[PDB]
Ligand binder design. Structure first.
Ligand SMILES: O=P(O)(O)OC[C@H]1O[C@](O)(CO)[C@@H](O)[C@@H]1O
Ligand SMILES: O=P([O-])([O-])O
Ligand SMILES: [Mg+2]
Ligand SMILES: [Tl+]
Ligand SMILES: [Tl+]
Ligand SMILES: [Tl+]
Ligand SMILES: [Tl+]
Length: 329
Protein backbone atom coordinates (compact mmCIF):
# COMPACT_ATOMS: atom_id res chain seq x y z
CA UNK A 1 0.00 0.00 0.00
CA UNK A 2 2.87 2.38 0.76
CA UNK A 3 5.07 0.49 -1.69
CA UNK A 4 3.97 0.71 -5.33
CA UNK A 5 5.44 -1.19 -8.25
CA UNK A 6 4.74 1.37 -10.95
CA UNK A 7 5.69 0.95 -14.62
CA UNK A 8 8.60 3.33 -14.08
CA UNK A 9 10.10 1.34 -11.20
CA UNK A 10 9.66 -1.88 -13.19
CA UNK A 11 11.26 -0.66 -16.41
CA UNK A 12 14.00 0.93 -14.26
CA UNK A 13 14.60 -2.14 -12.09
CA UNK A 14 14.37 -4.00 -15.40
CA UNK A 15 17.23 -2.50 -17.40
CA UNK A 16 19.22 -1.90 -14.21
CA UNK A 17 21.99 -4.48 -13.82
CA UNK A 18 22.11 -4.50 -17.63
CA UNK A 19 22.30 -0.71 -17.23
CA UNK A 20 21.60 1.45 -20.28
CA UNK A 21 21.36 5.14 -21.20
CA UNK A 22 17.99 5.17 -19.44
CA UNK A 23 16.15 6.66 -22.36
CA UNK A 24 13.81 3.63 -22.57
CA UNK A 25 12.55 4.70 -19.14
CA UNK A 26 12.29 8.30 -20.37
CA UNK A 27 10.41 7.01 -23.42
CA UNK A 28 7.97 4.88 -21.50
CA UNK A 29 7.34 7.59 -18.85
CA UNK A 30 6.57 10.13 -21.52
CA UNK A 31 4.25 7.63 -23.25
CA UNK A 32 2.41 6.88 -20.00
CA UNK A 33 1.77 10.61 -19.65
CA UNK A 34 0.12 10.75 -23.06
CA UNK A 35 -1.92 7.63 -22.35
CA UNK A 36 -3.13 9.10 -19.05
CA UNK A 37 -4.31 12.23 -20.83
CA UNK A 38 -6.05 10.23 -23.57
CA UNK A 39 -7.73 8.08 -20.93
CA UNK A 40 -9.16 11.17 -19.13
CA UNK A 41 -10.37 12.57 -22.44
CA UNK A 42 -12.10 9.32 -23.44
CA UNK A 43 -13.79 8.82 -20.07
CA UNK A 44 -15.59 12.15 -20.61
CA UNK A 45 -15.55 12.60 -24.38
CA UNK A 46 -19.30 13.09 -24.61
CA UNK A 47 -19.28 15.94 -22.10
CA UNK A 48 -16.14 17.41 -23.64
CA UNK A 49 -17.76 17.04 -27.07
CA UNK A 50 -14.81 15.01 -28.34
CA UNK A 51 -17.06 12.66 -30.32
CA UNK A 52 -17.49 13.39 -34.03
CA UNK A 53 -15.08 13.68 -36.96
CA UNK A 54 -12.09 15.94 -37.67
CA UNK A 55 -12.83 16.42 -41.36
CA UNK A 56 -9.78 14.50 -42.60
CA UNK A 57 -8.66 11.15 -44.02
CA UNK A 58 -5.57 9.15 -43.06
CA UNK A 59 -3.12 7.76 -45.62
CA UNK A 60 -5.10 4.96 -47.28
CA UNK A 61 -8.65 5.30 -46.00
CA UNK A 62 -10.00 6.44 -42.62
CA UNK A 63 -12.37 9.14 -41.37
CA UNK A 64 -10.34 11.09 -38.79
CA UNK A 65 -12.13 11.56 -35.47
CA UNK A 66 -11.60 14.42 -33.01
CA UNK A 67 -10.03 11.98 -30.57
CA UNK A 68 -7.65 10.86 -33.36
CA UNK A 69 -6.19 14.37 -33.68
CA UNK A 70 -6.07 14.94 -29.91
CA UNK A 71 -4.48 11.61 -29.11
CA UNK A 72 -2.06 12.08 -32.03
CA UNK A 73 -0.82 15.51 -30.86
CA UNK A 74 -0.29 14.22 -27.32
CA UNK A 75 1.68 11.13 -28.27
CA UNK A 76 3.91 13.12 -30.63
CA UNK A 77 4.56 16.00 -28.25
CA UNK A 78 5.45 13.65 -25.40
CA UNK A 79 7.63 11.35 -27.48
CA UNK A 80 9.49 14.38 -28.80
CA UNK A 81 10.13 15.97 -25.41
CA UNK A 82 11.37 12.62 -24.14
CA UNK A 83 14.80 13.03 -25.74
CA UNK A 84 14.69 9.35 -26.62
CA UNK A 85 13.36 9.17 -30.17
CA UNK A 86 14.53 10.25 -33.63
CA UNK A 87 11.91 8.84 -36.00
CA UNK A 88 8.16 8.71 -35.38
CA UNK A 89 5.58 6.81 -37.41
CA UNK A 90 1.91 7.60 -36.88
CA UNK A 91 -1.24 6.17 -38.47
CA UNK A 92 -2.35 9.79 -38.74
CA UNK A 93 0.71 10.96 -40.63
CA UNK A 94 1.39 10.28 -44.31
CA UNK A 95 5.14 10.68 -43.81
CA UNK A 96 7.40 9.67 -40.94
CA UNK A 97 8.21 12.45 -38.47
CA UNK A 98 11.84 13.38 -37.96
CA UNK A 99 12.69 14.69 -34.51
CA UNK A 100 14.55 18.00 -34.35
CA UNK A 101 18.28 17.52 -33.66
CA UNK A 102 18.23 18.89 -30.13
CA UNK A 103 15.59 16.48 -28.80
CA UNK A 104 16.75 13.39 -30.67
CA UNK A 105 17.21 10.09 -28.88
CA UNK A 106 18.03 6.66 -30.34
CA UNK A 107 14.56 5.11 -30.71
CA UNK A 108 12.15 4.81 -33.60
CA UNK A 109 8.52 4.72 -32.48
CA UNK A 110 5.62 3.45 -34.57
CA UNK A 111 2.18 4.04 -33.09
CA UNK A 112 -1.57 4.08 -33.57
CA UNK A 113 -2.54 6.94 -31.19
CA UNK A 114 -6.13 5.76 -31.06
CA UNK A 115 -7.23 2.39 -32.43
CA UNK A 116 -10.83 1.17 -32.79
CA UNK A 117 -12.31 4.19 -34.59
CA UNK A 118 -15.65 2.52 -35.35
CA UNK A 119 -16.20 1.76 -31.66
CA UNK A 120 -15.65 5.30 -30.32
CA UNK A 121 -19.16 6.77 -30.58
CA UNK A 122 -20.75 3.70 -28.99
CA UNK A 123 -18.43 3.76 -26.01
CA UNK A 124 -16.80 0.42 -26.76
CA UNK A 125 -13.20 -0.26 -25.59
CA UNK A 126 -10.56 1.63 -27.59
CA UNK A 127 -6.80 1.78 -27.23
CA UNK A 128 -3.35 2.95 -28.24
CA UNK A 129 -0.72 0.75 -29.89
CA UNK A 130 3.03 1.22 -30.05
CA UNK A 131 6.14 -0.51 -31.37
CA UNK A 132 9.62 0.68 -30.44
CA UNK A 133 12.73 0.12 -32.52
CA UNK A 134 16.35 1.08 -31.92
CA UNK A 135 17.74 3.05 -34.86
CA UNK A 136 20.52 0.98 -36.39
CA UNK A 137 21.78 3.15 -39.23
CA UNK A 138 24.53 5.64 -38.41
CA UNK A 139 23.29 8.11 -40.98
CA UNK A 140 20.69 10.84 -40.57
CA UNK A 141 17.35 9.71 -39.19
CA UNK A 142 14.75 9.00 -41.88
CA UNK A 143 11.59 7.07 -42.82
CA UNK A 144 13.77 4.06 -43.69
CA UNK A 145 14.62 3.69 -40.01
CA UNK A 146 11.00 2.64 -39.50
CA UNK A 147 11.18 0.04 -42.27
CA UNK A 148 12.38 -2.75 -40.02
CA UNK A 149 10.94 -6.23 -39.47
CA UNK A 150 8.97 -6.66 -36.25
CA UNK A 151 11.63 -9.17 -35.18
CA UNK A 152 13.75 -6.08 -34.37
CA UNK A 153 11.25 -4.71 -31.88
CA UNK A 154 12.83 -3.77 -28.56
CA UNK A 155 9.57 -2.98 -26.87
CA UNK A 156 5.93 -3.19 -27.78
CA UNK A 157 2.52 -2.90 -26.21
CA UNK A 158 -0.79 -1.11 -26.09
CA UNK A 159 -2.99 1.00 -23.87
CA UNK A 160 -6.52 -0.41 -23.53
CA UNK A 161 -9.26 2.09 -22.60
CA UNK A 162 -11.84 -0.48 -21.51
CA UNK A 163 -13.67 -0.86 -18.22
CA UNK A 164 -10.33 -0.19 -16.60
CA UNK A 165 -7.31 1.42 -18.26
CA UNK A 166 -4.45 -1.03 -18.83
CA UNK A 167 -0.91 -0.73 -20.16
CA UNK A 168 0.43 -3.98 -21.57
CA UNK A 169 4.18 -3.88 -22.09
CA UNK A 170 6.21 -6.51 -23.94
CA UNK A 171 9.98 -6.49 -23.87
CA UNK A 172 12.67 -9.09 -24.60
CA UNK A 173 12.08 -11.04 -21.39
CA UNK A 174 8.26 -11.21 -21.41
CA UNK A 175 4.90 -9.48 -21.04
CA UNK A 176 3.65 -7.42 -18.11
CA UNK A 177 0.32 -5.72 -17.44
CA UNK A 178 0.00 -2.35 -15.72
CA UNK A 179 -3.36 -0.94 -14.60
CA UNK A 180 -3.87 2.80 -14.29
CA UNK A 181 -4.78 3.91 -10.76
CA UNK A 182 -6.96 6.92 -11.60
CA UNK A 183 -6.56 8.38 -8.10
CA UNK A 184 -2.78 8.89 -8.22
CA UNK A 185 -2.24 8.72 -11.99
CA UNK A 186 0.27 5.87 -11.85
CA UNK A 187 0.47 2.69 -13.94
CA UNK A 188 0.74 -0.16 -11.46
CA UNK A 189 1.81 -3.77 -11.99
CA UNK A 190 -1.12 -6.19 -11.79
CA UNK A 191 0.01 -9.03 -14.06
CA UNK A 192 3.60 -10.23 -14.19
CA UNK A 193 5.11 -12.38 -16.95
CA UNK A 194 1.83 -13.10 -18.79
CA UNK A 195 1.63 -16.34 -20.77
CA UNK A 196 -1.25 -17.13 -23.10
CA UNK A 197 -2.98 -20.52 -22.94
CA UNK A 198 -1.74 -23.15 -25.41
CA UNK A 199 -5.32 -23.53 -26.55
CA UNK A 200 -8.43 -21.35 -26.14
CA UNK A 201 -12.16 -21.80 -26.82
CA UNK A 202 -12.99 -18.49 -28.40
CA UNK A 203 -12.61 -17.40 -32.01
CA UNK A 204 -12.75 -13.80 -33.12
CA UNK A 205 -13.30 -12.37 -36.58
CA UNK A 206 -15.82 -10.24 -38.46
CA UNK A 207 -17.91 -12.99 -40.11
CA UNK A 208 -19.58 -10.20 -42.13
CA UNK A 209 -16.84 -10.90 -44.68
CA UNK A 210 -17.64 -14.64 -45.05
CA UNK A 211 -18.33 -13.96 -48.74
CA UNK A 212 -14.74 -12.86 -49.37
CA UNK A 213 -13.00 -15.27 -47.01
CA UNK A 214 -10.50 -17.78 -48.43
CA UNK A 215 -11.33 -21.50 -48.26
CA UNK A 216 -8.88 -21.82 -45.40
CA UNK A 217 -10.63 -19.29 -43.18
CA UNK A 218 -14.01 -20.64 -44.28
CA UNK A 219 -13.07 -24.17 -43.30
CA UNK A 220 -11.61 -23.13 -39.99
CA UNK A 221 -14.74 -21.23 -38.94
CA UNK A 222 -16.95 -24.19 -39.79
CA UNK A 223 -14.73 -26.41 -37.69
CA UNK A 224 -15.09 -24.03 -34.73
CA UNK A 225 -18.87 -24.21 -35.10
CA UNK A 226 -19.02 -27.88 -35.94
CA UNK A 227 -16.20 -29.71 -34.18
CA UNK A 228 -15.31 -32.91 -36.06
CA UNK A 229 -14.54 -34.77 -32.82
CA UNK A 230 -17.81 -33.83 -31.09
CA UNK A 231 -16.18 -31.35 -28.72
CA UNK A 232 -17.95 -28.19 -27.57
CA UNK A 233 -18.00 -25.57 -30.31
CA UNK A 234 -15.98 -22.42 -29.69
CA UNK A 235 -17.61 -19.27 -28.43
CA UNK A 236 -17.59 -16.26 -30.72
CA UNK A 237 -16.37 -12.82 -29.70
CA UNK A 238 -15.70 -9.74 -31.84
CA UNK A 239 -15.58 -6.38 -30.06
CA UNK A 240 -14.50 -4.54 -33.18
CA UNK A 241 -11.46 -2.91 -31.64
CA UNK A 242 -8.14 -4.74 -32.23
CA UNK A 243 -6.72 -3.77 -28.84
CA UNK A 244 -9.74 -5.16 -27.00
CA UNK A 245 -10.01 -8.36 -28.99
CA UNK A 246 -6.28 -9.02 -28.69
CA UNK A 247 -6.14 -8.33 -24.97
CA UNK A 248 -9.01 -10.77 -24.45
CA UNK A 249 -7.08 -13.27 -26.53
CA UNK A 250 -3.99 -12.76 -24.35
CA UNK A 251 -5.74 -13.28 -21.03
CA UNK A 252 -8.40 -15.79 -22.08
CA UNK A 253 -6.61 -17.54 -24.92
CA UNK A 254 -7.97 -18.49 -28.32
CA UNK A 255 -7.60 -16.74 -31.66
CA UNK A 256 -8.16 -13.38 -33.32
CA UNK A 257 -8.25 -13.05 -37.11
CA UNK A 258 -8.11 -10.31 -39.72
CA UNK A 259 -7.05 -12.41 -42.68
CA UNK A 260 -6.49 -11.53 -46.29
CA UNK A 261 -9.66 -11.80 -48.34
CA UNK A 262 -10.88 -11.77 -51.96
CA UNK A 263 -11.06 -7.97 -51.86
CA UNK A 264 -7.99 -7.37 -49.66
CA UNK A 265 -4.78 -9.26 -50.45
CA UNK A 266 -2.89 -7.80 -47.48
CA UNK A 267 -5.91 -7.60 -45.16
CA UNK A 268 -6.82 -4.34 -43.41
CA UNK A 269 -4.62 -3.78 -40.39
CA UNK A 270 -1.36 -1.84 -40.54
CA UNK A 271 1.80 -3.86 -40.08
CA UNK A 272 3.96 -1.14 -38.55
CA UNK A 273 1.72 0.19 -35.78
CA UNK A 274 -1.03 -2.44 -35.57
CA UNK A 275 0.11 -5.94 -36.44
CA UNK A 276 3.79 -5.86 -35.41
CA UNK A 277 3.26 -4.62 -31.82
CA UNK A 278 0.52 -7.16 -31.25
CA UNK A 279 2.53 -9.86 -32.98
CA UNK A 280 5.40 -9.00 -30.70
CA UNK A 281 3.32 -9.06 -27.51
CA UNK A 282 1.76 -12.31 -28.57
CA UNK A 283 5.09 -14.00 -29.14
CA UNK A 284 6.57 -12.68 -25.91
CA UNK A 285 3.61 -14.37 -24.25
CA UNK A 286 4.22 -17.77 -25.87
CA UNK A 287 1.73 -17.21 -28.67
CA UNK A 288 1.88 -17.02 -32.44
CA UNK A 289 0.97 -14.44 -35.06
CA UNK A 290 0.79 -15.14 -38.79
CA UNK A 291 -0.42 -13.96 -42.18
CA UNK A 292 -1.50 -17.53 -42.83
CA UNK A 293 1.67 -17.98 -44.86
CA UNK A 294 4.48 -16.29 -42.87
CA UNK A 295 5.26 -14.94 -39.37
CA UNK A 296 4.25 -11.28 -39.08
CA UNK A 297 7.48 -10.26 -37.34
CA UNK A 298 9.59 -11.60 -40.20
CA UNK A 299 8.06 -9.34 -42.78
CA UNK A 300 10.34 -6.63 -44.15
CA UNK A 301 8.12 -3.60 -44.82
CA UNK A 302 8.48 -1.25 -47.81
CA UNK A 303 5.72 1.17 -46.79
CA UNK A 304 5.19 2.70 -43.35
CA UNK A 305 1.43 2.35 -43.91
CA UNK A 306 1.72 -1.16 -45.37
CA UNK A 307 -1.11 -3.58 -44.57
CA UNK A 308 -0.76 -7.14 -43.34
CA UNK A 309 -3.10 -10.06 -42.76
CA UNK A 310 -2.89 -11.28 -39.18
CA UNK A 311 -3.88 -14.38 -37.25
CA UNK A 312 -2.75 -14.54 -33.61
CA UNK A 313 -3.32 -16.22 -30.28
CA UNK A 314 -2.86 -19.59 -28.63
CA UNK A 315 -0.18 -21.51 -30.52
CA UNK A 316 -2.37 -24.58 -31.02
CA UNK A 317 -5.29 -22.58 -32.43
CA UNK A 318 -3.00 -20.58 -34.72
CA UNK A 319 -1.26 -23.79 -35.87
CA UNK A 320 -4.55 -25.58 -36.61
CA UNK A 321 -5.38 -22.72 -38.95
CA UNK A 322 -1.89 -22.83 -40.48
CA UNK A 323 -2.33 -26.52 -41.22
CA UNK A 324 -5.54 -25.62 -43.05
CA UNK A 325 -3.72 -23.04 -45.15
CA UNK A 326 -0.93 -25.52 -45.88
CA UNK A 327 -3.48 -28.15 -46.90
CA UNK A 328 -5.00 -25.65 -49.36
CA UNK A 329 -1.65 -24.36 -50.57
O1 LIG B 1 -15.14 -3.34 -39.04
P1 LIG B 1 -13.96 -4.26 -39.29
O2 LIG B 1 -13.67 -4.39 -40.77
O3 LIG B 1 -14.02 -5.57 -38.56
O4 LIG B 1 -12.69 -3.43 -38.68
C1 LIG B 1 -12.28 -3.78 -37.35
C2 LIG B 1 -10.83 -3.39 -37.16
O5 LIG B 1 -10.59 -2.03 -37.61
C3 LIG B 1 -9.71 -1.37 -36.69
O6 LIG B 1 -10.41 -0.31 -36.07
C4 LIG B 1 -8.50 -0.80 -37.41
O7 LIG B 1 -9.02 0.21 -38.27
C5 LIG B 1 -9.29 -2.40 -35.65
O8 LIG B 1 -9.25 -1.82 -34.36
C6 LIG B 1 -10.44 -3.41 -35.70
O9 LIG B 1 -10.00 -4.68 -35.27
O1 LIG C 1 -8.94 4.19 -36.75
P1 LIG C 1 -8.14 3.02 -36.33
O2 LIG C 1 -7.09 3.47 -35.37
O3 LIG C 1 -7.50 2.41 -37.52
O4 LIG C 1 -9.00 2.01 -35.67
MG1 LIG D 1 -6.02 5.23 -35.23
TL1 LIG E 1 -6.96 7.14 -38.23
TL1 LIG F 1 -9.47 5.91 -34.05
TL1 LIG G 1 -6.46 -0.16 -39.97
TL1 LIG H 1 -6.03 2.29 -39.93
Amino acid sequence: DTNIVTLTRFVMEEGRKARGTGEMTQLLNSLCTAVKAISTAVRKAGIAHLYGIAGSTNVTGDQVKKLDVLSNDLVINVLKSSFATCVLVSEEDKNAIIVEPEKRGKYVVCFDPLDGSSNIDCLVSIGTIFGIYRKNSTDEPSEKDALQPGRNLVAAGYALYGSATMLVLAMVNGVNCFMLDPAIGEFILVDRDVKIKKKGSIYSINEGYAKEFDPAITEYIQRKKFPPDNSAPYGARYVGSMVADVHRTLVYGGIFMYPANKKSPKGKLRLLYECNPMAYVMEKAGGLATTGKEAVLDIVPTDIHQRAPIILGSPEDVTELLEIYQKHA
